[PDB]
Amino acid sequence: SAAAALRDQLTALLSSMFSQGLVDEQFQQLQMLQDTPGFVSEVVTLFCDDADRIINEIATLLEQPVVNFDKVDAYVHQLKGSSASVGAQKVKFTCMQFRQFCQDKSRDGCLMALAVVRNDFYDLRNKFQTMLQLEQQIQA
C-alpha cells in the first residue's frame, strides 16, 4: 500500500537508531510515554533545538579572551541531562569527558571536545529529522 509502507520505513528507521548505538532505553521510555500521539516528535523537535543552542552557548564561552570553564562545565552538564532523557547516549557520555577538560582549564580539550559533541549531535539529528518526516506523513 502506502501508509503500511511508511510504518515499515518508520519502524525500519527507528530500528536503525538502536542498531547503530545512537540511542538507548531512555528513547525506548519516550516511546513508552507516548503510549499524546505526537509526543515523541515534539520531544525530539525540542531536544533538537535546545541542544544546538547549548552547543552554541558553549562555543561562545570558548571564544572569550578569558574562558569561564565554570559555565562551560554547567552547559555541558545540562546538555548531558537533555541527552540521557531523549536517549542520545553518546552525546551524553562525551559530555562526561568535558569536566576533565574544564577542570584542566584547557581551551583545546574543550574546543575539540565540543567537536566530538558536534560529531554525535549531527549523526542523531540526521536519524531524528528522517523520523520526524515519516511521523508527519502518517497523515499527509
CATH (domain of 8): 1.20.120.160
Residue 38 cell numbers, joined: 505526537
Nearest-5° Cα angle at 130, 18 to 116: 60
Considering just the CA atoms, what is the radius of gyration of the chain in Å?
Answer: 17
Q: Name residue 135's amino acid.
A: E
Extract the C-alpha cell encoding 99: 569536566
Report how this structure was experimentally obtained: X-ray
Count of structural domains within the chain:
1
13 burial type by CB count under 10 A (0-12 exposed, 13-18 middle, 19+ buried): middle
CB 107 within 8 A of CB 67: yes
Secondary structure in 3-state letters for the chain: CCHHHHHHHHHHHHHHHHHCCCCCHHHHHHHHHHCCCCHHHHHHHHHHHHHHHHHHHHHHHHCCCCCCHHHHHHHHHHHHHHHHHHCCHHHHHHHHHHHHHHHHCCHHHHHHHHHHHHHHHHHHHHHHHHHHHHHHHHHC
Q: Which amino acid is at 20?
A: Q
- Residue 88: give the domain boundaries: 1-140
Question: What angle is formed at CA 53 by the lines to CA 21 and CA 80, rounded to 5 degrees?
Answer: 40
